[PDB]
Amino acid sequence: LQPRRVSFRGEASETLQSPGYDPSRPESFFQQSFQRLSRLGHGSYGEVFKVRSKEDGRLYAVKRSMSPFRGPKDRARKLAEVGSHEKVGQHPCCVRLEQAWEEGGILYLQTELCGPSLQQHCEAWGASLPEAQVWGYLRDTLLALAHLHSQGLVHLDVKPANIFLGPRGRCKLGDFGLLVELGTAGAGEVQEGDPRYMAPELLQGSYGTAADVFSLGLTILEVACNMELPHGGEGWQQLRQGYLPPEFTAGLSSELRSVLVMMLEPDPKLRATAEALLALPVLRQ
Ligand SMILES: CCOc1cc2ncc(C#N)c(Nc3ccc(F)c(Cl)c3)c2cc1NC(=O)/C=C/CN(C)C
16 A cells, blocks of 8 residues: 565664655556566565666665565565564675665565676576686685674575676675574574575574585585585585586696685684685785
């Protein structure tokens, strides 16, 4: 019946307005306050559109949930993505949240528009990315991670689909859907991540910032070696016992291989932190 702002900075959920938006007409705030340009992605969650605002003329991405809130928990769960994104705050290697609102039980998240995901970029090039690119992405994403970890946040979904290219070879970590704030158990908490990137200790319910380091580890491995990660089975196990698969790891320089072994350390207690990684010689200007 009317669009209401979703934020956790202030309590009072307030209604939106926009040039283009006259509440009289039947069309939603979305339909009416934006120029829908194309579909960036879609799935069980809902849809992401590339849009141009009719408020500022700028391009953004807007995620829209698929069906109206099923109940109070379903609402609180979806609304919590906004809380997660807000806890991150502004950082040059984190996707920026513009605003978010709800209307008719549907949640909308409006982010800045970035370049392609790392997943698309690798897919388009169809081969292992050059080592010089990898180091830049490895470094941007560690900076993002160290920003999160310093605040007791764990992304839990580090992977190429959630890393987005920016100008001149930089990138941004985004999509804080599964982000959790450590020390707080719930709720609901720890929705399940992609098993291809799962730190081994998560299997037995051991969660911590170390999980993200391991995920970025496989993420860098995948893009560096044009390698598909296994969902399960012996192959999944082989990546989680310390050593590296020697097949596609061939091209890696000594320095890259060295850093990946640090990140893929099975024991979270012994696994390098993002801070420690960033203080290694190979990873600072
Ligand atoms: C050319 C540029 O393409 C994209 C640019 C993006 N910029 C910012 C954000 C952000 N944030 C994106 N995703 C996104 C995540 C979660 C959110 F909640 C919100 Cl609002 C937005 C983006 C997604 C893009 N495109 C794709 O997702 C590509 C998918 C390929 N296929 C596997 C479907």
